[PDB]
């Protein structure tokens, strides 16, 4: 299928302590595989899934020096942004970044990403063309002109089309009997009496990966978006996920209702009713 890599970076300033905390998490196919954190005793990119221990000390030392560079980059940028937004001292501030690449099933670059947010808010992003920048804020225009005049987009384009792709290829080959799995959901339906003449039927899906899933209810034919309650997909804590969707229903006439579970690990959508 298709594949991806992302680095998610964060720097947080606080009123007191004299330097921002910086954290970077790498993901391959939306699963964590590296991590650097400046608060750690040994600030260094540590590995995060079994398959990454294949890398020699030369890989970790280079990546760690890279993170130290980013930390200092985030540090100066935080300073500059404070001035750009005429923010005084004595506050908390956040600078975040997402970057990476999406491959197709043919292992070629589909899309590159480079995005920044300040205070949790879109600040500047490299457009899909990997040549021009989107920056909504008036304050962000200063950064955008600076980066337009410096050929920054060329530098990021080369990483995204080159290193990002080349090294993701490499990471997939090393953990092939690892990230080439999906756990299908196990669904069941439970029954919950309420205000009589009526009853809540609750469709459960358990033990699935990845997290994307859809649960529908049907009154013998047409789907029910009202008032179908659901929860947001949640981690079970063991790598798998959980979800439920419920619909309230006349007591006795409940065998009319059907629940469907759509997941990318199923050979086909599952179909389910209440079983007394």
């Amino acid at each position: 299928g298709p594949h991806s890599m992302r680095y998610f970076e964060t720097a947080v300033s606080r009123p007191g302590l004299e330097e921002p905390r910086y954290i970077s998490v790498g993901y391959v196919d939306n699963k964590e595989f590296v991590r650097f954190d400046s608060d750690a005793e040994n600030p260094r990119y540590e590995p995060r899934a079994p398959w990454m221990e294949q890398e020699g000390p030369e890989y970790w030392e280079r990546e760690t020096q890279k993170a130290k560079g980013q930390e200092q980059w985030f540090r100066v940028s935080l300073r500059n942004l404070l001035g750009y937004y005429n923010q005084s001292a004595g506050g908390s501030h956040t600078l975040q970044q997402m970057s990476g690449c999406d491959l197709g099933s043919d292992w070629r670059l589909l899309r590159g990403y480079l995005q920044f947010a300040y205070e949790g808010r879109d600040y500047i992003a490299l457009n899909e063309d990997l040549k021009t920048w989107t920056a909504a804020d008036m304050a962000a225009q200063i950064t955008r002109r600076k980066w337009e005049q410096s050929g920054a987009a060329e530098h990021y384009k080369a990483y995204l089309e080159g290193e990002c792709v080349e090294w993701l290829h490499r990471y997939l080959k090393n953990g092939n009997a690892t990230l080439l799995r999906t756990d299908s959901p196990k669904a069941h339906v439970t029954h919950h009496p309420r205000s009589k003449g009526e009853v809540t039927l609750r469709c459960w899906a358990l033990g699935f990966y990845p997290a994307d899933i859809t649960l529908t209810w049907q009154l013998n034919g047409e789907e029910l978006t009202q008032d179908m309650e659901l929860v947001e997909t949640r981690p079970a804590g063991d790598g798998t996920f959980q979800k439920w969707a419920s619909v309230v229903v006349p007591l006795g006439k409940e065998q009319n209702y059907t629940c469907r579970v759509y997941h990318e690990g199923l050979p086909e959508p599952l179909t389910l009713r209440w079983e007394p």
Binding site: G26, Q70, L114, F116, I124, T143, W147, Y159
Partner: peptide, 9 residues
């Protein structure tokens, strides 16, 4: 492989 950034903001 991590990106390294170009000009600061």
């Amino acid at each position: 492989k991590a990106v390294f950034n170009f000009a600061t903001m």
